[PDB]
Amino acid sequence: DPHDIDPKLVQKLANDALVWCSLRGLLVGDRNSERSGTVPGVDMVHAPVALIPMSFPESHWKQACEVAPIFNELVDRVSQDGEFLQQSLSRTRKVDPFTSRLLEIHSKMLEINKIEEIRLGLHRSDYMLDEQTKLLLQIELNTISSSFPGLSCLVSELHRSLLQQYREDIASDPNRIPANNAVNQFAEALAKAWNEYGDPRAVIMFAVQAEERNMYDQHWLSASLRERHQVTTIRKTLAEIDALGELQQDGTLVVDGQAVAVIYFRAGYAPSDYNSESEWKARLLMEQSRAVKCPSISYHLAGSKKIQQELAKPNVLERFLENKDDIAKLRKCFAGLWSLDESDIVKDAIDRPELYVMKPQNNIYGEDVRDALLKLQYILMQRIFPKISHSILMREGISHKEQTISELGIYGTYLRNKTEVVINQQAGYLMRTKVSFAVLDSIYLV
Amino acid sequence: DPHDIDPKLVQKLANDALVWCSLRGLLVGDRNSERSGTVPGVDMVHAPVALIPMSFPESHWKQACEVAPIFNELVDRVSQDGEFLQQSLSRTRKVDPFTSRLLEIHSKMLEINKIEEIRLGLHRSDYMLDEQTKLLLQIELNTISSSFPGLSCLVSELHRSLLQQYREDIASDPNRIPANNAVNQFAEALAKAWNEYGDPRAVIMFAVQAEERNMYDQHWLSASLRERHQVTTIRKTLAEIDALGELQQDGTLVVDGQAVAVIYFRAGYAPSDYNSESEWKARLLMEQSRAVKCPSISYHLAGSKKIQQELAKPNVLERFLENKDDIAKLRKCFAGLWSLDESDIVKDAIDRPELYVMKPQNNIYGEDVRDALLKLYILMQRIFPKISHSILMREGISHKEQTISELGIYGTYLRNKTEVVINQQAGYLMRTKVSFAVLDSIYLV
Ligand SMILES: Nc1ncnc2c1ncn2[C@@H]1O[C@H](COP(=O)(O)OP(=O)(O)O)[C@@H](O)[C@H]1O
Ligand SMILES: Nc1ncnc2c1ncn2[C@@H]1O[C@H](COP(=O)(O)OP(=O)(O)O)[C@@H](O)[C@H]1O
Ligand SMILES: N[C@@H](CCC(=O)N[C@@H](CS)C(=O)O)C(=O)O
Ligand SMILES: N[C@@H](CCC(=O)N[C@@H](CS)C(=O)O)C(=O)O
Ligand SMILES: [Mg+2]
Ligand SMILES: [Mg+2]
Ligand SMILES: [Mg+2]
């Protein structure tokens, strides 16, 4: 129990954790700096981290890893069914201007029979463990800008080194922290995608935000690409891509005199990244190009919460997958999922709101679900009640003893060309722990 | 020529250099932060670095590496001659209160026949290359708190990676940057010293300053000690050592319930580290202990500029070394060196001050040497290095500057009763500065 640890020992652990982060690149830009998100190497601070790894059952860890390749294949097959995406999201588009514009781009790609022969997925599936039922249940599937493959790897090593250093003071087995190689598996998948594209002069472009205090996480990927696969990367905003990008007659994307083989998005997932029309033109320009997108417009739309909800309905998974065991494994991870047009469920949410969460496609919980639904006269989800644990959280040099809940992310790499699937695997993990703000964590298997 | 590089390419190099530093621990505490020197992991900035490695002749690099083990042996033999240190520094002690107190501690160790059977040296010998004569000449020998073994290693890798990444844009051979493993060779020497001490529960104590913006350099050493040799380290100030330190009957130093096998000093080299009597008692406490000191009081005094100057005088090197080739190799590195009691030299410095530097044992150059001597410290031959072009990175900003450079060679030395266990060159440091200073590496030509 971390709250029982002597404060003298917490301070020593804290100092050693802070030193380790500083020497090993587990860093973010400081939130109180105007420069830390634009100029690398200035106003840096350790990434917010748990001081001790979070206990997590191995059985459920294994379950999460086992479904990763099934979700990866599912995302790919869902994305190929253009009409399914358009049908599922047609109510969303009248109320959400952002989704509507994404669907416009998708529509334009279907109008010209655009084919993505090489398709790359860099996913993270996020889970919570329900205390009472002991079920690992999916909270979401990220198909765009999956954060922390760089940093989560380091947190595993941080915790393993701390437990090794303090064996005399804390009783543990450091081998209970599982190996986490997400950054290099992500780098490998990006490199193989570049390799399938077949241009030895081409680069991988990172589409990034103008201000990015999590730049070091992204730079860990590009460092792995350069040092382990000799692939060049560039960083550009959507505005910069509009200004500096054009298409050649064959559809090759050229950005500042360099051919772009792969586009890896760490931006363009929210309306606020699209400051003007320039950013939307850039998005459309990239999509019609011959480049490998991660994600493509299809893959992006496939990660929508509305799609997650449609995939839970009877017979829908059987449209996309033939293997009945794989389907059963996915359904074991599904919490209850519903739209506001399922009126029996809306009435039930009004009668028993404590059991539901109302999630936009700013979450609403408990008593407030009743009020919001009554005003309306968004998706509805089974409320998950995780274990509230004790942990010690580090932020800006200061240790805090806190009541926390945790959330397990499983990274997934997927790559296919015309006939063949080249990569489809689980690719490491993320544990995020937060107060009942959030920190990076790892797992200690029990 | 770095000044001819297109500004678009400088910016790309700069960004890649800054990223690399951030991911690979080439960091210092920010100078404009009240916390960066006391709280690790906050208000950090890349270490000031050259963007491009400095050109340096291989012949002179080799000369510098070849004399490293001779200096290491010399420091050891000079330190054993207690009466030589006391005689050489007896004029210094009446005018410098700090040196006098160091000599008091030494005197007390000689009074009780204190023997250091295990002697550890972590040295850096600093050189400048004279443009006109083409001579590598020693500027000083550091026997205490030799900075940058952690960071200088990283700068070599930084430059090698940049040159590798930009082969299409800059014509170079990255293999011309020599391998630099100073941090791990320093760690190994500290680990072997701990091993000779023979206590598997004992720790290596770092004696450190209360505020230290170069903490990450030091932490690289302790990280190497923990991860590659399973030796624990602690960090303590001199005041903390006075408060938390005692001696057992057999002379074992215990600091906060932990036996201390090796004391590695990154403090206690200047008067301002001794805020009160507490710090002096701590220094005396550690010296009389059974622990391996790096440096011992003898080794500390042996690195004095006055000793450097005495070692340059006729027949003195022949007191300590028997091999005439080794002596000749050292004398080839010596610039002219003199004390203020050599009156012929003082008069000459008054007549031709431009040729001299007046160095305290705050340096004085040129015209000002005349004025200071007329008002009335060592006198040294002024060395005139090559003024080069380079690009310096500080706080995220690249500066094109006129620079001079300074080569440091690290040296590891370890002996027990009979045997010398380690005596080698142990990597390098290149510091480059405006005609402020940055870390650099070498590109051999
Ligand atoms: N079904 C659920 N039950 C309980 N808590 C949930 C559920 N879904 C999400 N949460 C909580 O809300 C947080 C946000 O998750 P999500 O809604 O998927 O992303 P966002 O914060 O971007 O809206 C989660 O970290 C989790 O703590
Ligand atoms: N003989 C010399 N000729 C020219 N410059 C010198 C000479 N000695 C020292 N310097 C310059 O002065 C700086 C500081 O002197 P140094 O002897 O290293 O003492 P400290 O490290 O205490 O400042 C050196 O980095 C070097 O650039
Ligand atoms: N811009 C941030 C992305 C932050 C973010 O919120 N990412 C979401 C997916 S949009 C995640 O769940 O990781 C980055 O690139 O690191
Ligand atoms: N206290 C700082 C600085 C020490 C320092 O400047 N040392 C001098 C010799 S005292 C050197 O030449 O490296 C550190 O430990 O890094
Ligand atoms: Mg999603
Ligand atoms: Mg010097
Ligand atoms: Mg010296």
Numbering used by the authors:
A (entry chain B): 14 to 374, 380 to 395, 405 to 463, 474 to 483
B (entry chain A): 14 to 374, 380 to 394, 405 to 463, 474 to 483
From the paper:
Glutathione, the tri-peptide γ-L-glutamyl-cysteinyl-glycine, is the main low molecular weight thiol antioxidant in both plant and animal cells, often present at millimolar concentrations in vivo. The most recent expansion has been coupled with a diversification of structure and biochemical function that has given rise to enzymes that are introduced into the host cell, and likely possess novel substrate specificities.
For comparison, the only GS gene in the corresponding plant host of G. pallida (Solanum tuberosum, St-gss1), was similarly expressed and its product purified. Using this approach, the maximum rate of the host GS (St-GSS1) phosphate release was 7532 (±1358) umol/mg/min, consistent with a previous report for Arabidopsis GS of ~7500 umol/mg/min, demonstrating the suitability of the assay. The position of γ-EC in St-GSS1 is coordinated at both the glutamate and the cysteine residue. Corresponding residues in all G. pallida GS-like effectors are not conserved in sequence but are preferentially small and uncharged, while the third residue, arginine, is 100% conserved: consistent with permitting interactions with a cysteine residue. However, the glutamate of the di-peptide is exclusively coordinated by interactions with charged side chains of residues in the binding pocket (R, E, 2xQ, N, and Y). All six of these positions are substituted in Gpa-GSS22 and Gpa-GSS30, thus suggesting that the lack of canonical activity is because γ-EC is not accepted despite the potential for cysteine to be accommodated.
